[PDB]
Amino acid sequence: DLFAPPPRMQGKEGRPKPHIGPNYESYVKEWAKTVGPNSDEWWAAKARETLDWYDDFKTVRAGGFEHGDVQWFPEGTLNAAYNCLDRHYYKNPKKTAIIYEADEPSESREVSYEELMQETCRVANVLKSYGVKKGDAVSIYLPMTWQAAAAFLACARIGAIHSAVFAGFSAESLRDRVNDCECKVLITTDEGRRGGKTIATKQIVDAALQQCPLVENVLVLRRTGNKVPMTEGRDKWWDEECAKMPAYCPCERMASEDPLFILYTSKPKGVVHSTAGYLLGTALTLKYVFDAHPDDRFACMADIGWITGHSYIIYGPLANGITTAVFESTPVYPTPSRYWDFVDKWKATQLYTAPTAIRLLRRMGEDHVKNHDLSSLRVLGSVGEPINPEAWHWYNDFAGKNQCAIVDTYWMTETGSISIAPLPGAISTKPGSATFPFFGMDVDIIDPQTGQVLEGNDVEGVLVARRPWPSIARTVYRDHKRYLETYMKPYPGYFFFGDGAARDYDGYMWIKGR
Amino acid sequence: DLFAPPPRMQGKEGRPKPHIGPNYESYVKEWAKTVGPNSDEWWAAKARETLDWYDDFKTVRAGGFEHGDVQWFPEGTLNAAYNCLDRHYYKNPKKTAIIYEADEPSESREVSYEELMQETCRVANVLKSYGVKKGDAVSIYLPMTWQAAAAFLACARIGAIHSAVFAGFSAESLRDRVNDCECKVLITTDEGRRGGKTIATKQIVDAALQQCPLVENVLVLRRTGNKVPMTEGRDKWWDEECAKMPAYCPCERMASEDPLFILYTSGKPKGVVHSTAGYLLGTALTLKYVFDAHPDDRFACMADIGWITGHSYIIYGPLANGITTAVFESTPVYPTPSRYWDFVDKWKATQLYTAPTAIRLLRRMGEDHVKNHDLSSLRVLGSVGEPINPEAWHWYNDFAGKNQCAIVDTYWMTETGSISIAPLPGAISTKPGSATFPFFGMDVDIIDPQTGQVLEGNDVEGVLVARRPWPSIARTVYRDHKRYLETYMKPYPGYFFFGDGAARDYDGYMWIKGR
Amino acid sequence: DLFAPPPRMQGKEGRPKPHIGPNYESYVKEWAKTVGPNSDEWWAAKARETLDWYDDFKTVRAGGFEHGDVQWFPEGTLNAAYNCLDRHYYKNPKKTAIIYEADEPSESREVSYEELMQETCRVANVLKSYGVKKGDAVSIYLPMTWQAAAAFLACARIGAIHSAVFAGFSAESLRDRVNDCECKVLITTDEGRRGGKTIATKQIVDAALQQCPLVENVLVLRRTGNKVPMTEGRDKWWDEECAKMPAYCPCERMASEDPLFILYTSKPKGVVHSTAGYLLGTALTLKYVFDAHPDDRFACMADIGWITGHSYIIYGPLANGITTAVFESTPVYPTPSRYWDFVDKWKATQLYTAPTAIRLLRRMGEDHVKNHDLSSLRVLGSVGEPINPEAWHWYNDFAGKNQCAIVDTYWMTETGSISIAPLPGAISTKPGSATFPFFGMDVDIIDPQTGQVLEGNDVEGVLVARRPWPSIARTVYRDHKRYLETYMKPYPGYFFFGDGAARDYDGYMWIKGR
């Protein structure tokens, strides 16, 4: 029940050679440099190689779990939108940043880095004309359209802290998150289209804003064009506001520990992520866990309202300068072959889905996946919950045709990027196992009965992290006490994931879950 | 009718050697490095040599005409007030930044770089106390007084976007521009003195502010000292506010593409927006090369600071170069039609930059006012604003330069930022009424309006277009980017539309027919 | 009556070697480099060696007395809180930043650099949540508790100009200072404890704020825990607000000439100090005048509401990365041996007091100091007024046991740091004499009758400074005309101290005073 890296992950058949490989020893050799007291040099070199800095940093890391003063590269200044848009636009403006798969397949198209950069700059200029300053919160209530990315980056361009809310959340949840983030600006659509169904996003927005006094400006994207109520003064059309603005906006120089965004967990708790550490973590996980290469076309099927959508739809892939996919539909619309039709049409090199979608597709039958070419795929990703051996085997056999590496990535919103996953070109996978910790992750197992670390293999308990990592959450927005109580107080000296986990005789990690 | 550069432009008679010369081939050699796909090295070298940067840039240029996302040196940070005041103050504080020629000739005096920097810092501190932030618009309604420059630079010191309004504008024009820029602070004077005449500037300001709700603070310069109405709380005297402030203010670190200023074109007036680094570089380079400016030179542009000529070649260009500039408060015919030449003789001006209207008026005023003046310190005579007739050109050459000064016919607009087509004085043989050759970074062409295609070769006529962006090009129209694109970019896709008909003769010289 | 540097200041008996010594010639050699037209190299080297800069400076100095446009290192950017907390926290987090001697001796404890940094960052986050921006004034009405050092530095961390008011000032003085600085945020305690006595700081604050319209937020430190009135909305508890905030805050990159703080002289006149020049001056005076070394324990017993508390309790010692003492009590509480009990308990290496406290202790009798060890002491400092020969001799004989160098430091709030003092390891002292000018100080004596500088030795007149020094006051807050009239108009070309002074035949300076 062991699956070595496939030939597509061995650099054969014209496929790119893996970044780390070919076996477990190479992963160990590289991972030893990323943890421990001598790991500062590796992290400094990676931060300078991966991200573009306006000012260089001096200190690599500081702080800890006990007080929630975690710092990474504090003296450096950078911009997330510069690292995700501007440098790649300068290198190659015509390269596709986003493959936008609309709800209707005929409406899908490619958005270049130039178009995405121009839209981001227009939205950033609109936000600046609204009075949005560095450190201000901007709520984003958007469906899975490509402009959402622009919206995100727009905030990241001006130093605003964006707070994304799942589209289709009720008026109460949206109101709670908007009130907690204390935003004065909300970005939303008139309506959303998903699975051939209409989401009345603007009606929900009006119902929620009836109880959100601090919101003064609403920017409304005309996604569908159907009639929606628009309050005079408060509501403005995205296209009309952006037509008045120039297609370029200067980047605000952010400290490394400036909060990049707030993401509310589904009182809602707002996990806060800073700029440089989170960006470095997601870029490195995208490059290594999925073996991304410059010409790759990443296809993550999550939602931008989720942490997976934050990391491996927007920030991670665009920081790497590769093509990412924004999928506006459901896996069974119009037909349960939608994922595979999309992969064949766009020649996706990686696929990142959730076990729930895989299970639904498996329940939908084999005729929808059996006759598809695929074969541009190299890495198949799973995230969100433990994947059963049957679902794992269906994913391997039909979506990858036994020629793609299957990565079971375990992480949370508070970890920022992937924590435990197999390296596709090095690690032999076990079905339903998140195998080994990522770079900078020193995870162990504590016995909850005694609170002591269970050394060795073939043990079971609660999963903890020994040391902070660059992409860890820094606080809970205006609720640092809750942050410390949830993640740092249960086991002092360790970060508490809250997931029961086991390590088998081979050292492989098995996440039991919450 | 060809005029080679005179001996004063040949480095002889103790005059400085020209930066570019002595003939057309040298101009071509330097210009070829400033255009095309291999010109990034030249522009990066010039940007690093001419301007002082707080942070270095990585990219030289990006963007284009189609969407209006033009970028020059985007990653670099700098300050216009630092590059126009502080570095020259550090090098030589006692050097004259401004020769202020007052309306009354006995009231004229030299303002040093130290005094100008201190005044700029006091006004910047006042504006900061008013709550003005980086990116905020500040309206300026000032006559041709030297403190106006300070006011300009004051905004540029704190990241404020200044919006200059010509002091001759009525209450309605001032109100329209002030409302469009959405400023909360207006810098103005009690009264102006031009041609012995009084401009009731504060009265017009009150009439306009009756319909300008967003303006909360008015800073009033006591220019004449006559009684004017002063609203309690809203209006404060410039001297009283500046006395409470320190004489130094820190320079705010500004991105290259941060908007330096808004200038409204004379239905709704269009606010042409200029960024900082590209515009500063363009104006400094045009000032150094088109007028052959040298460190000890005394530049005399007699335009108004309410127009782009005053923005570029009274304030930003000459002060970025660290030379003496002139602020002329009077008219060409006050007190007598010899005022220009009396000024040039008294201050030993090395360059003159006027408009064909003033030269035509002086020519109609008779030769008795110019024939008996020395004027030998002059080396370059500049004309800007409209095509200059051969008779006016010859009167300018023979009477003002005494046939010993180069005549530059500089063609450009507010949207170009700096001079686009002009003769290089030490290299180009001029033809009267001709803006001869494009400046560095300008790749101009003639397009047939009926067909829309570029008319290659010589002896062609059509509309003037620019193939590629240049550092000092306007970035947008304030809150009206659609108007910017429609006016300058959609008429001929892939090109920048000047709106001016132009012809190129057999020698390659450009002739601007005009709008 | 001449006193050569003692063996404790000669590098003997295991004591650190003095930075400058052993005689007057060495002081002259080092001081000649710090004044004159060729002193820019020395000051540039010292600025780059002493302070951590975000951006390097190009110009060393500019401006002058006549217009009050003094500039030092204008193009450089830095942060005072970074230089006082972050770099030392990065080098050694567990080192004691503050020895907090509480009013009750049993309540005293050591605050480490990590704890001080975390408290400063929490307060900075609270202030940022109050809307405090760079350049905004924040009033501080705090007793001699260690958190005051945090509050100060919190402002310095975010570019806020802190304005400290002596605790125990009446409601009218507090109101005048708060109204003049135009602050919108006030930091104070519920009550203060000094000399076993209670100071109703919150009651005075309420009485003052009844006439301070611009104040919108009050942060109240629960120093004693006794019941005080708290206005709903306006007043919030320090601990409650700080518990919601993360323990790290990014440092605002500040221009060198950005105003660090406003200190009102006891209409109140707010002396304004910029960041880089003041920080450099205080750090250099602390290092050289007191011969501070990395492991030293500086004990300045002034008040943080005074300029001495600004320079040699908070900024100077913490910039040097050494331990500083925050003394909450009086010299005679609970007994007149409190100073010497504290010195013996914490092994203070330097003591910096005022002549009034020394005279009070001398009046209290010799039985309180005669039996104390006091061996760790090396330097004894006096500041505030001319110290009588009898008081000087008592200080030398009983507090130092004729084994400590006695430095008489003359300076004002407008000089920022010490102007005239003996270098302890080099200068032979005379009782009641501030001997020689400090680095960058070129003082002279002007005859007030004629206004001309009196050349040579054995002259008397008014003390003037020929050239600006880095730590000189830049202005009086919104009263620059008063600043010029007080300090620069009486003798054009010079800085007027306002103190009559004499120089004897040996070149020693004798300050007559106001």
Ligand SMILES: CCOP(=O)(O)OC[C@H]1O[C@@H](n2cnc3c(N)ncnc32)[C@H](O)[C@@H]1O
């Ligand atoms: C990235 C989503 O972050 P969140 O939406 O905050 O959910 C985080 C929570 O999902 C669960 N989980 C995620 N990935 C896996 C996995 N590979 N195997 C098992 N369980 C998993 C786990 O319980 C975790 O703590």
Ligand SMILES: CCOP(=O)(O)OC[C@H]1O[C@@H](n2cnc3c(N)ncnc32)[C@H](O)[C@@H]1O
């Ligand atoms: C600098 C003033 O800028 P503006 O006030 O925006 O006027 C810009 C408009 O003036 C005209 N013009 C300016 N210089 C010349 C010239 N040398 N020869 C011919 N015509 C000229 C032209 O029509 C242009 O388009």
Ligand SMILES: CCOP(=O)(O)OC[C@H]1O[C@@H](n2cnc3c(N)ncnc32)[C@H](O)[C@@H]1O
């Ligand atoms: C640091 C206190 O600054 P301030 O509270 O502003 O008082 C400043 C004023 O105290 C006096 N003074 C301070 N130190 C001494 C000293 N060593 N010898 C004599 N007189 C001194 C002097 O009159 C000065 O001008």
